[PDB]
Amino acid sequence: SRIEREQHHLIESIEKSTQYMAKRRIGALISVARDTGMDDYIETGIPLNAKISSQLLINIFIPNTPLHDGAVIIKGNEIASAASYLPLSDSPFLSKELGTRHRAALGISEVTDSITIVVSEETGGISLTKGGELFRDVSEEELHKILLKELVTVTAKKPSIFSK
Numbered sequence: 001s002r003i004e005r006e007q008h009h010l011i012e013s014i015e016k017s018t019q020y021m022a023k024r025r026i027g028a029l030i031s032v033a034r035d036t037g038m039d040d041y042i043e044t045g046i047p048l049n050a051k052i053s054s055q056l057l058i059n060i061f062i063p064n065t066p067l068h069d070g071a072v073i074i075k076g077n078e079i080a081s082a083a084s085y086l087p088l089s090d091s092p093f094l095s096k097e098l099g100t101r102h103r104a105a106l107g108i109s110e111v112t113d114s115i116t117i118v119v120s121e122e123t124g125g126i127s128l129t130k131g132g133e134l135f136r137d138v139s140e141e142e143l144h145k146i147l148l149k150e151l152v153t154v155t156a157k158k159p160s161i162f163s164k
């Protein structure tokens with residue numbers, strides 16, 4: 001496969017699934033691994049090793065289901081695990097009206113270079129964490145630009161399965 005295609009499909013899959021869940025107030029927590037590995041947190045969840053799709057991301061987070069209680073971790077071109085533990089931030093700067101999903105997303109962002117996306121159970125707002133910072137209630141346009149900048153690392157070049 002071709003990474004550029006993989007990376008844009010990942011972005012689209014996050015955008016479509018979080019849009020779907022935001023409209024319905026479905027809580028979600030999706031962490032995308034980058035240069036810092038998250039293998040230890042993958043091991044805490046239920047292994048999926050699945051192809052990335054918006055449909056599977058949505059089905060995972062349906063409330064009161066086996067896979068919904070925790071984080072999804074995406075590693076390379078797979079949904080690696082669901083219902084994974086992430087470390088909680090102890091920061092007193094995180095607003096008290098945000099839930100544990102936000103605290104978990106902040107916590108993993110403080111110890112990895114991962115990009116984590118949260119859909120709020122209470123408001124449907126979409127938030128993102130990176131490097132110990134929270135980007136709260138981002139618009140669809142803002143989410144798109146952030147994901148483009150952080151998850152697409154290849155410019156326009158010749159497609160090839162050997163790219164890596």
Ligand SMILES: Nc1ncnc2c1ncn2[C@@H]1O[C@@H](CO)[C@H](O)[C@H]1O
Nearest residue numbers: 069070071084085086099100101104
């Ligand atoms: N340690 C954790 N790691 C990942 N998600 C967590 C953790 N603790 C709570 N959550 C999230 O909080 C619950 C609701 O806020 C979600 O079901 C779950 O994803």
Ligand SMILES: [Cl-]
Nearest residue numbers: 099101120121
């Ligand atoms: Cl929430």
